[PDB]
Amino acid sequence: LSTCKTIDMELVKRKRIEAIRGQILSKLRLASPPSQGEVPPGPLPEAVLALYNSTRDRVAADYYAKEVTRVLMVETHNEIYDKFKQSTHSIYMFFNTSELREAVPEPVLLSRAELRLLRLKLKVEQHVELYQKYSNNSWRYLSNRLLAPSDSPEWLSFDVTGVVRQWLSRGGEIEGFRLSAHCSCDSDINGFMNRPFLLLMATPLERAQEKNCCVRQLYIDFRKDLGWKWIHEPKGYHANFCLGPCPYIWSLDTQYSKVLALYNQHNPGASAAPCCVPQALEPLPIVYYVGRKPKVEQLSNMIVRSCKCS
Amino acid sequence: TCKTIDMELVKRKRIEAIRGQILSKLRLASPPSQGEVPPGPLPEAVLALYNSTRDRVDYYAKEVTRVLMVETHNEIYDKFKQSTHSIYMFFNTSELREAVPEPVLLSRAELRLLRLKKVEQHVELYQKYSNNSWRYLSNRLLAPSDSPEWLSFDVTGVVRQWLSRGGEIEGFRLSAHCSCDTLQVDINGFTIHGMNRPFLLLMATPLERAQKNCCVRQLYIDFRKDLGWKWIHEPKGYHANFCLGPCPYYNQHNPGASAAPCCVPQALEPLPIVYYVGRKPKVEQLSNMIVRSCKCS
Amino acid sequence: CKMVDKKVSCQVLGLLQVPSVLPPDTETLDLSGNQLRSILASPLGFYTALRHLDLSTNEISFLQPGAFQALTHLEHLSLAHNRLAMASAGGLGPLPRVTSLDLSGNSLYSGLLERLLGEAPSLHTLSLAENSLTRLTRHTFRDMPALEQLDLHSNVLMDIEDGAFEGLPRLTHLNLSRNSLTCISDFSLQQLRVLDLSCNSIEAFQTASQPQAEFQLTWLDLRENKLLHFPDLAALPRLIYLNLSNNLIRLPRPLSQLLNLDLSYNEIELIPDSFLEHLTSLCFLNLSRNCLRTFEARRLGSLPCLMLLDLSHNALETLELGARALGSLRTLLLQGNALRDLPPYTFANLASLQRLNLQGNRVSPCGGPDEPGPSGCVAFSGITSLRSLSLVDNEIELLRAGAFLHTPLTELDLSSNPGLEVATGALGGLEASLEVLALQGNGLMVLQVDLPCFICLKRLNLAENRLSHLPAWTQAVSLEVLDLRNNSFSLLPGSAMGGLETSLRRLYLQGNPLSCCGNGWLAAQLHQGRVD
């Protein structure tokens, strides 16, 4: 009664060819491949190839629990007002770094840090942006938000993970952000008591430390694997596939520590029936002839870059 | 279509999976001992933190079609020129309609900028309905580069409303950020000058194509009742879910999973909990706990 | 601790170490449930006469080596649910006379099991369930040839190297339920007799082919797995029980000795003719909750020994079962299917049918010689061997006069057939045979049958009907319980039901519009032999 040893990819690869042919046909709303012989042979025209290259070319753990803790903004009465008081267009939220490091003892542990504000202004639309206290004088831009009006107070969430980690590792005694109104070259909240705070989330210091589902390589050439001439560009693409059966692990109250890590790679989602499925995909642009004019089209979610159990 | 589900068995499978998932995420070898938990309610600060963390705060192919910017010497230099502040761009709306006739066909559209070559530059993209109009779109923080590169802003909605009610010529403005207390970056077409100029790479549905199963099921989890755990203090159970149902051979569908597809979650929400590790309480957040909606893959 | 002759039974709680004050003559010692955090050899070694030692559910983590070697007469050691895996290399020394050893619940893992134990020549039973075992390497079960039963359920077993059970020639019982196994490529345990692979993730199951030796497996449980096919069990001739339930087994002698096949919840859509031939001598066949569309057992000699056939909650549309084919079939379950029209003599040809459930179908009966019915009716009129019949929710609007005239059945249920117009004397042939009758939810205005004439009737149900008066009883009733809920009954005078009290002991009248003043004798009936 021995466990199954190997998996024959020589069958699964062809079974993937069978399905990906159908996916190519379906994505273009084609019942059968078009006739290639009628269009005279020749290169794709230069402008069409430039368009195809424009679409082709590039441009521009989380499983384990995270202890949550929060650090409240310093009182506006003593550190903040004396040099960075509230103005018509800006506010300044300063935080004590000593207690910030008390909340998270090591910078490597911090996973997420959400600066949170509560807004009292209800109906007037406004564009506001968030800057870091970068030095004794300077500021650096983090992000901005468009405040869609609403009739009730609401909580804002600003992701400040990198700034907070930099603060833990290099920060001084007092630091903070500026949140100020957007303005151009040609041209509110509680505390400015539910005052703004940093909801840190970090791994606890006491907790810092061919079978399984994986993406498996497959390259498809339209000319020989699918026997297609009607598709002119690209010649082929990597339609890599997911394999590796995810077994359901029957849980139990008392579990050995090295076995508690088996869930994160066989059933992260606590599904009743896990299966190895694609997690991340990206499109495939193509050029082909229907009628007598080339067509540049983008087919979405074709390549496989990652696989996950359920 | 054919299915032979025993819903009770699926539910118990997810209950026993939630047990192991919660214990594994916390890396608890066994349920923590309650032998020294203080009596009475949780501290006010702990409940405040728990409330703080608990509160809320297409399949088918697209037609690719470029449309180039109007020549800067022909319609733009008559009223606007590149300056220290901003660059101005304008597009023939009739050409946009020619590329894509009706708004309901457009799916995506991005303005493909090219940077010729320096310093960390903050640039933002505005609309320009007219000389007096102001409307922000997006921005990017452009790090120094050693080579030219393309950069894109997703501008789908603006192009759709242009197709709905656009005039003849209108466009964008690319401005350097103005901290409220210069456009050093160089662009093609606002110095090779006449080609590779900014354009919209439209994606649209062609007119010749334009014209229970897998779903989230409800399942409440009561820690004290179905798992028997006394050590989770809040919540007194959480409203988890699962999903089930056949998937025929879908926005993110791809048959590359196996010989048959699967009904799997797309959206999952974390669960914050509070519990006592020995003497002191701890608030933790577990990710991918609550199932919101499911795909077919 | 409590004391009995040559036996000590320490209570659930109160002790931190093994007591030193017990008699040296102690032969049985129970210490379970206690806070014992270790087993040092010094206190325990005094009791060399120990034969049984239950240390179960203690906090034991450290076992001093040689502690269990000194007790030469120990026969049963139970260390269940302790904390051994947090340890004591060779903690359990050699165990010459231990016949049973329970280690379940300790969270033992692969690698530590192989050094925790020692030579156990006479070990008959070993329990390792509820542990964290993940792999059965070549070197797992060495040094225990006399093992006959092995328990490994609730483990995380994913891999089993070829020959992991090579050192267990006498193993007869192997329980791998609720494990994480995923594909079984071989089966060569000639000694084994019971195999439980239920609640696993097995997608495929395979065995040896053309073996040079026989196999002794008699009981295979392969259910709640991911099996996509019916396994090739040609090499398992002696298999008696097989439960493939809750798999994904679509169908496309090896099982001549199989007696109980449970093939429900398996996405099956068709049963090929060659399939049922291999199931000769089968006595139970559960095909419930499949996508099956028609049963085609028309071949003579098909399923000769089958006593039960469960086809409930399929999409079954018609039955092609042949005459004298299902000869021994005693019970036939067909509820929840979509039977509409059948040959009239479908169920009459079942030679030894005893129970027939047709609830949820839409079959229509007919009376045969008396008041012939339309085409496509089913002739229940002459099923001599039948004894219990159900026609609930068959949407029967009219019941024929000779519906059951030559079928002496004992229980009949016609409930929830709205608007059932019972023809006068429709149930005539059941007066001397029927013992229970149900007509709930029919909405019928009047009972069109001489109900007191049913000499053999024992219980009756008429609830949720528009009925207003009952036929006049005139003799000592054989009835025992009568159910009349939510009906339009207004009076129950002695002239109408007198004689029921001789055997009646339970009654239901709640919800009926009894006359507040004219009920009369009902209040006196309520005194004794009545309820509500």
What backbone torsions phi and psi does residue A309 show, to the nearest 5 degrees? -80, 110
Choose the mutation target among A51, A53, A57, A68 for the interface with B, i.e. most B CBs under 10 Å.
A68
Say yes or no: B25 and B88 in one domain.
Answer: no
Residue C247's φ and ψ, nearest 5 degrees, are: -100, -170
> Looking at the structure, do residues B78 and B185 belong to the same domain, yes or no?
yes
Residue pair C370/C393 in contact by the 8 Å Cβ criterion:
no
Grouping H, G, I as helix, E, B as strand and the rest as coil, residue B22 is helix
Q: How far apart are CA A169 and CA B88, in angstroms?
A: 43
Structure tokens at B91: 């597009």
- Contact between chains at C107 and B29 (C-beta distance less than 8 A): yes
**Of C63, C83, C85, C193, the residue nearest C134 (C-alpha):** C85
Alpha-carbon gap, residue A27 to B258, rounded angstroms: 19
B184: nearest Cα among B192, B193, B175: B175
User: Cα Rg for chain C, rounded, in angstroms?
Assistant: 32
How many Cα neighbours within 13 Å face the side chain of A138?
4
* Residue A198 shares a structural domain with residue A93: yes
What does C313-361 look like in DSSP terms, one character per residue?
A: TS---EE-PPTTTSTT--EEE-TTS------TTTTTS-TT--EEE-TTS
User: Is the CB of residue A115 less than 8 Å from the CB of residue A93?
Assistant: yes
Give the position of tokens 């009954």. C489
Residue B270 and residue B232 share a domain: yes
CA angle A24, A27, A28 (to 5 degrees): 90
Q: Does any domain span residue A266?
A: yes
Beta strands in C359-443 (DSSP E): 388-390, 398-399, 411-413, 421-422, 436-438
Quick one: A140 and A238 in the same domain? no
> Residue A191 is part of a domain; what is its CATH number?
2.60.120.970
Q: Helix (H, G, I), strand (E, B), or coil: what is residue A263?
A: helix
Name the phi and psi angles at A82, rounded to 5. -65, -25
In chain A, what residues touch C217 (CB-CB under 8 Å)?
none
The structure tokens listed for C504 are: 């009646």
Domain at B221, CATH number: 2.10.90.10
| Nearest to B170, CA basis, from B79, B62, B66 | B79
Question: Which of B204, B227, B246 corresponds to the end of one domain?
Answer: B204
> How many domains does chain A fold into?
2
Q: How far is the C-alpha of B229 from the C-alpha of B23, rounded, in Å? A: 11
Whether A242 and B252 lie within 8 Å, measured CB to CB? no
- Structure tokens belonging to residue A148: 């869609």
**B69 and B42 within one domain:** no
User: Do C109 and A259 lie within an 8 Å CB cutoff?
Assistant: yes
Closest CA to C380 of C417, C318, C436, C370: C370
* Cβ atoms of residues C366 and C383 within 8 Å: no
Does B171 lie in the same domain as B231?
no
Nearest CA in chain C to B29: C107
Q: What whole-number distance in Å separates Cα of residue A100 and Cα of residue B53? A: 17
Q: Is residue A10 part of a domain?
A: no
Picking from B2, B6, B9, the nearest residue to C291 by CB comes out as B2
Residue A290's φ and ψ, nearest 5 degrees, are -130, 130
Say how far apart CA A280 and CA B293 lie, in whole Å.
17
**Residues B180, B273: one domain?**
no
Backbone angles phi, psi at C447, to 5 degrees: -75, 120
List the structure tokens of A229: 């001439």
- φ, ψ of residue C310 in degrees (nearest 5): -105, 115
List of chain C residues whose C-beta atoms are within 8 Å of the C-beta of residue B5: 265
Strands (E), chain A: 66-72, 90-96, 110-119, 126-133, 139-147, 154-159, 174-181, 197-202, 214-216, 220-221, 231-233, 236-237, 241-243, 276-290, 293-309
- The string over C486-499, giving b where at least 16 C-beta atoms fall within 10 Å of a residue's C-beta and e elsewhere, is bbebebbeeebbbb
Position C329: which residue type?
A: L
Instruction: Verify that A281 and A178 share a domain, yes or no.
Output: no
Contact C286, C260 (CB under 8 A): no
Where do the structural domains in chain C lie, given as residue ranges?
1-180
Question: Are the CB atoms for B121 and B186 separated by under 8 Å?
Answer: no
Start-to-end CA span in chain C (Å): 55
With an 8 Å Cβ cutoff, are A259 and C186 in contact? Answer: no
- A59–chain B nearest CA distance, Å: 5
Tokens read off for C430:
């059941």
Listed residue (B198, B104, B184) closest to B151, CA to CA? B198
Pairing of strands C219-221, C194-196: parallel
Question: B169, B185, B204 — which closes off a domain?
Answer: B204
Residues of A in contact with B177 (CB under 8 A): 141
Where does a domain end: B153, B173, B204? B204
Is the bond into B272 cis (omega within 30 degrees of 0)? no
Q: Is residue A108 part of a domain?
A: yes
Which of helix, strand or coil describes residue A285?
A: strand
Nearest CA distance, A5 vs chain C (angstrom): 7
Query: Using the 8-state DSSP alphabet, how is residue B123 labeled?
Result: E
| A8 domain residue, yes or no | no
B155 and B223: one domain?
no
Q: Across chain A, how many H-helices and E-strands are there?
A: 6, 15
Q: Do B4 and C269 touch (CB under 8 A)?
A: no
Contact B64, A297 (CB under 8 A): yes
| In a shared domain, residues B140 and B182 | yes
Method: cryo-EM
Render B272-297 in DSSP notation, one character per residue: EEEEEETTEEEEEEEEEEEEEEEEE-
B296 - beta bridge partners?
Answer: B263
Q: Minimal Cα–Cα distance from C383 to chain B, Å?
A: 33
Give the tokens for residue A176.
Answer: 């903070």
User: Two tokens at A62?
Assistant: 């989380």
CA A170 to chain B, closest CA, distance in angstroms equals: 22
Please give the C-alpha separations between residue C256 and each of B115, C215, C240, in angstroms, as whole numbers.
Answer: 78, 14, 9
Task: Evaluate the CA torsion angle B19, B21, B22, B23 in order and state its sign.
Answer: positive
- Domain membership of residue A87 (yes or no) is yes
In terms of C-beta density within 10 A (0-12 exposed, 13-18 middle, 19 or more buried), how is residue C188 classed? middle
Please answer yes or no on whether A255 and C154 come within 8 Å at the CB atom.
no
- Which single residue is written with the structure tokens 């007119």? B207
Run of H or E residues at B153: strand B149-154
Classified as helix, coil or strand, B105 is helix
The alpha carbon of residue C469 and the mean position of all alpha carbons in its chain are separated, in whole angstroms, by 43
Contact C53, C74 (CB under 8 A): yes
- Contact status, residue C387 vs residue C354, Cβ threshold 8 Å: yes
Tell whether B104 and B137 lie within a shared domain.
Answer: yes
- The structure tokens listed for B55 are 């509160």
- Give the class (CATH, top level) of C1-180: alpha beta
- The dihedral of CA C467, C471, C476, C478: what is its sign? negative
Taking a C-beta distance cutoff of 8 angstroms, is the pair C244, C279 a contact?
no
Q: Per the domain annotation, does B292 fall within a domain?
A: yes
**Pairing mode of beta strands A276-290, B149-154:** unpaired
Give the minimum alpha-carbon distance from B39 to chain A in angstroms, rounded to a whole number: 23
Q: C344-359 burial, b for 16+ CB within 10 Å, e for fewer?
A: bebbbbbeebbbbbbb
**Rounded distance between C-alpha atoms, residue B21 and residue A174, angstroms:** 40
- Which residue type is seen at C184? I
Taking an 8 Å cut-off on Cβ atoms, the answer to whether A59 and B285 are in contact is no
Tell me the two tokens of residue B75.
């319609």
CA–CA distance, C285 with A162 (Å, rounded to integer): 64
Query: In sequence order, which ranges of A113-190 are alpha helices (DSSP H)?
Result: 161-170
What gap in Å lies between CA A261 and CA A272, rounded to an integer? 18
Contacts of C266 in chain B (CB under 8 A): 4
The single-letter code of the amino acid at A105 is P
Which DSSP helix (H) or strand (E) runs through C39? strand C38-39
Q: According to DSSP H, which parts of chain B are helical?
A: 7-25, 44-54, 93-99, 156-165, 207-210
* Structure token pair of residue B134: 């102001």
Strands B263-277 and B232-234, bridge-based pairing: antiparallel
Q: What angle do CA B267, B269, B271 make, to 5 degrees?
A: 160
Contact C159 A3 (CB under 8 A): yes
Instruction: Name beta bridge partners: A33.
Output: none
Integer Cα distance of C489 and C512 in angstroms = 6
- List all chains that touch chain A, counting a touch as 3 or more CB pairs closer than 8 Å: B, C
**Termini Cα distance of chain B:** 15
Distance CA C308, CA A155 (A): 65
Domain span holding position B241: 7-57+212-296
